[PDB]
Symmetry: D3
Subunit: 245 residues, 6 copies
Amino acid sequence: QLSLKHRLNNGDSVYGIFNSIPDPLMIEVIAASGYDFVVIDTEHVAINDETLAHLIRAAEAAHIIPIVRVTAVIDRDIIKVLDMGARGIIVPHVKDRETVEHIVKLSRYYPQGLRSLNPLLDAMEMANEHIMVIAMIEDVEGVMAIDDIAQVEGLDMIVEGAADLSQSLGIPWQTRDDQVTSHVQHIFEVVNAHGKHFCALPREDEDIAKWQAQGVQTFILGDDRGKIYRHLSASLATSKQKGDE
Amino acid sequence: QLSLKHRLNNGDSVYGIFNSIPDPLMIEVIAASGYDFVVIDTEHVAINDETLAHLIRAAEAAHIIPIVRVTAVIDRDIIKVLDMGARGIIVPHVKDRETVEHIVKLSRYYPQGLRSLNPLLDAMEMANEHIMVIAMIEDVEGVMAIDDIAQVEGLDMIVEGAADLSQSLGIPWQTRDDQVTSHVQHIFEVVNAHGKHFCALPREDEDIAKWQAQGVQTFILGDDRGKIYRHLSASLATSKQKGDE
Amino acid sequence: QLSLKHRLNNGDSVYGIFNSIPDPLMIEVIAASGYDFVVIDTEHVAINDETLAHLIRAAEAAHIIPIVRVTAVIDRDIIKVLDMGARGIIVPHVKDRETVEHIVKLSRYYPQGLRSLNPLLDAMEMANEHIMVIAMIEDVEGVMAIDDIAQVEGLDMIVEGAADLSQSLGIPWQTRDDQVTSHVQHIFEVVNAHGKHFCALPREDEDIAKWQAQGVQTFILGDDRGKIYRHLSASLATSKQKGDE
Amino acid sequence: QLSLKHRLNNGDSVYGIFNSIPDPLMIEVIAASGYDFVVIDTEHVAINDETLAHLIRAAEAAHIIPIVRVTAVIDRDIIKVLDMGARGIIVPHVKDRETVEHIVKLSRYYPQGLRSLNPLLDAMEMANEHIMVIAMIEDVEGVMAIDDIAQVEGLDMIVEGAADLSQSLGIPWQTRDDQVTSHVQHIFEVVNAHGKHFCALPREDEDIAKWQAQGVQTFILGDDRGKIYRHLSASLATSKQKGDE
Amino acid sequence: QLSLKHRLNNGDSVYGIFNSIPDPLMIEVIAASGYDFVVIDTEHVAINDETLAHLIRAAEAAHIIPIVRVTAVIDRDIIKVLDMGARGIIVPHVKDRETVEHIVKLSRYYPQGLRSLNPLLDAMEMANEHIMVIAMIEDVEGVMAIDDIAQVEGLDMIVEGAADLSQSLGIPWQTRDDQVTSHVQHIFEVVNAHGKHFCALPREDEDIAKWQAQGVQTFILGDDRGKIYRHLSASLATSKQKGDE
Amino acid sequence: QLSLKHRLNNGDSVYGIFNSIPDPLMIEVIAASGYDFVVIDTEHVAINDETLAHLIRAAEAAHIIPIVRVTAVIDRDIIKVLDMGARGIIVPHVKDRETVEHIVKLSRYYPQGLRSLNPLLDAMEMANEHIMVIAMIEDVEGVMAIDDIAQVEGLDMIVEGAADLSQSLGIPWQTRDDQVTSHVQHIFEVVNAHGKHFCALPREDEDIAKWQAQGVQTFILGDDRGKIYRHLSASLATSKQKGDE
Ligand SMILES: [Ca+2]
Ligand SMILES: [Ca+2]
Ligand SMILES: [Ca+2]
Ligand SMILES: [Ca+2]
Ligand SMILES: [Ca+2]
Ligand SMILES: [Ca+2]
Ligand SMILES: [Ca+2]
Ligand SMILES: [Ca+2]
Ligand SMILES: [Ca+2]
Ligand SMILES: [Ca+2]
Ligand SMILES: [Ca+2]
Ligand SMILES: [Ca+2]
């Protein structure tokens, strides 16, 4: 299937990573490494639409679920990105119910939305059944409106954006601050109460256990670019010390 | 300068890595990680000429020396790759003196070669002074012809290709075999006797010290794709174990 | 000229097709096949702006009129797409008069609009004279607002979108339903009353005659991708039966 | 598997088509249409290496076997094209045994060749087992040298090139001439005697039965570009006649 | 630094040009020619995001300051364009204070805005310190709202758009008209009163002196495409006359 | 027609320029400037095959004759470049008769060559009739073999390469030296004696008259990149002096 919704329906825990190096070989390396899904990032990333389409094919061929984080311009991106075969979309900076309802309208065929049309009904039904509609909650407005957001029919999942939330709170990068963690904990509790999925971005491995015990199944473990830099820089420094004795 | 030849002339040890993911962000990540040079691979890699040109610019902007491994088709590649600004070229499967002399002809302006023309003389002189002409020695023929290869004026450096050498010897991937290591040791001794540079591909960090003690200054520490897969796969497995307690 | 407006002014019937495979060879194949115009689709299609520019050049070189269906983001797309040389634009999901007036503002130079400036006046005049401004009418809102839409000075043509209209009516793909056909017939009558052009998407060849008799001159006969799949799949099935006797 | 060699080993007949429109959507349309394999053409076609890599991924994701026809420059193309994941290669204008032996050297790992190295041995073995090495026989020299060509260990299949053969015979496009057909029949008989596969390019559906009865299993049914032009041009002409009554 | 803000802080006059041919060699030619900055145009230009990223790298490698004119869709473009390394952004058709404040929000990290997060604080601070936020004033609305626009904290510079202003005034291309010049003079006086920078687009060389005497330091001298056409066309005409005696 | 051969058959003088900035807007600017032909350079230039195809379409759409200078790898390039629609090819560093005969074989259909096949005969005939086969003479070997080169049936034109010839003579860039000019004069006389066309690269406008008087009709007036740099650098220096009074 390559359906995230299907994986979650079995009781599985699933692990992903952000892709911010828009190269199909990176998608294949991530798949080879054992990830269940990859979030191809298009918000910040310099990435051509035809490149994005290539990355989704790479994901499909490599048997990893392609999830896409789109830009703010959902009236342009969502139709294109779903027609390319993204199995899920993440919309950044979701702040209110009206935006979530619009995302659903754009993402789902009748009767669940009005996704543009471009057996037919069976294919539409299957699309609606398996697509993941995911909202980033990463500013104070979104945390405050979480109860109204979480109850929108068709919204499947919320992902915590602690970094941008910290800046929204006037404490950028203080993601360990009780303010940030209490807001994230609140987001989870409300999401969970409305029978929706929460996606954690655990800082450290131990945080996975802490979340898992409360019933979280979905985990994004950082981003490729960050992990690669940290590994290559550490590895090289160690090499240069060992070489000089 | 961004000249490998200049770095070596000071007594420096220099560290590089193969790039086989043809994305400018990878070049920038490699530079950020602390590498002195990057060998952008075009032999095996699916990589457009315009992409290669972009990667060399990324290297320049990120202050890392761009070295390029070209394909077998040197009469096409060398002129293009030098005009793009590669500071060094690696030619694969160098087997005889005649090939080395042809590489030099293609890589160097008069009076050192006949590099196509496309103050003028001063620029030509500076190009010749700083370019690194590098031959891969990776088959039995090349090891056997090493004395004739190493004495070609204009050949700056030899790089060991233990993997392909092992297959040439009918023992593919037995790179730890005494046959392979003795041939590589021979290559070094002959290269060094003719006052040329040797570039090691050490298997492990300890091998850097062993080579450095014999006067080797240049080291390629694997390739990005391999390191990334090994790190991401190890990291994820550890994460999944820690999450489940 | 390669002007659709010019062709229509002679009494010609003109035939087009949607292009949803963004390759210049497809544009050339469509031109070779005898089409008068091609609607290069960018709404749903994964297509780079530089690719689109290439397709328009292919059209020009192949002597086929390039019409472009843009995305919803007209404040971005229209200026780019006209400067690339599109001879007409189709805007999707036109729902009100205010949108049509904005399209005209963006598409036409003074005195007919405020198309960005980037003999000069003569070139502007010629652009305004020959550009086709085309609105898709494909949701109930647009059909209801058709009288207000059709009378906007500078709107040249309306195209029926029966598929998306059917979903808007809560009967997706029931394009043969009397609801859908009566609305499309209404759209035509109102458009025609205001002296504007109607563009039909006939389901079958016989529908061309039916429309032509009422004075329709413009016909889009499906899309390349759909026709190709249907032909290749039918052709192959026939081949496999004939081969096995 | 997506292995042509595997399909042939079961007694299957397999059907392919040339792709000369280098767009991943065309690969997907060909797969949807029911073809078992696609021959992505790079000999004549303007196609970037990164595009080719994308087309092979499209094929994999769409569950169609990707075969690639390379250029004459096998010392460049073969290593790249195999590393991209082509399941078979077609080399044009094969004229002698020496060329076939070189193709095998480039295409197969030790002990069957010397394909560059870039469990390890198991992966090499699997590659060798499943790769199809295919020679185009399309000039008089190649037909004359067919016995020496066909007996090269590692050559899997020969494909008839009647068009270019006709020009080689000084009768370009006279592919129905007894000269051309007798030479093609000879090629088959010799290939078949040496236990190798023959690939037919039948002119018409009836030719499939004629070949199949002699034990031919592999059929290339034209090329996408040609079929599309012929269908679109015929379809449009019929539409325009029906519209005018 | 490659900081325009830094250059202006020394008392320097700085010279730029619009780039509307999106090729990295053009960026390099502009740098070689002696320009201090280049305004890479994306408003009108057909230019892929990955191409734009390449042009910015070309600028960095060639030691020319990259400034980017974005499209109207600032909620998409600004984050991408800053993360690519643009040292300044120009937003077209700035008409009110609310838009300027939004540009600042998008362009600057806390505490000066809410630029998305993607030592950390030091890097943010350095970004804010060196970025140039630039508004195009090119319609009557913007001239009328200039006092409210100019006093927005975080707006660094205004650039005159005489061409589009002339069309806004109903006199397209009458850029020499007293209406246009008096409005531009007003824009400068108000901008200058609020301690902000003005960027002139002088028609002729003599206009540079006239502006410089009033304290203007920043000058855009046309666009590459226009200059190239005018030079090549003049040069060729002269050549053809000289050849025929 | 867009046939250089046709233009020359009327008694016209024709003017071209090298394109070494591989952007379709540059092709269009060159066409707008009044050039009869453009030599799209692929020898030195970083240029994707799909880009080259785009540039040829740009040329066709802009009504300028596209001529292509290929790389040394004629067995790869010529078939691709002709199928893309180049109206002429320039092969660099032509040194002997055997190479010219091979170029002709690759460039012309039966009976004039064996150009790969990919009314039919009429199209082949028209191709042969209008294609220009052009050899660069730019090394001492080629000048020495000029009589044998010039008499090859199917070779249409020779172009002088004074720059590379000077380096071949051990006097790189001494293109004004009597050695270089006497060799170029010899090339012309021999070419002209065999009824073939000569293409001059005049240093200065006055050289056009000198060549024209001897019956030369074809002139390449430099390259875009060089002219642009020289104009932009001169123009900017003048601007900066005028601004400072
Ligand atoms: Ca899913
Ligand atoms: Ca964020
Ligand atoms: Ca160097
Ligand atoms: Ca190797
Ligand atoms: Ca038109
Ligand atoms: Ca629609
Ligand atoms: Ca196979
Ligand atoms: Ca052939
Ligand atoms: Ca700056
Ligand atoms: Ca403007
Ligand atoms: Ca010609
Ligand atoms: Ca040359």
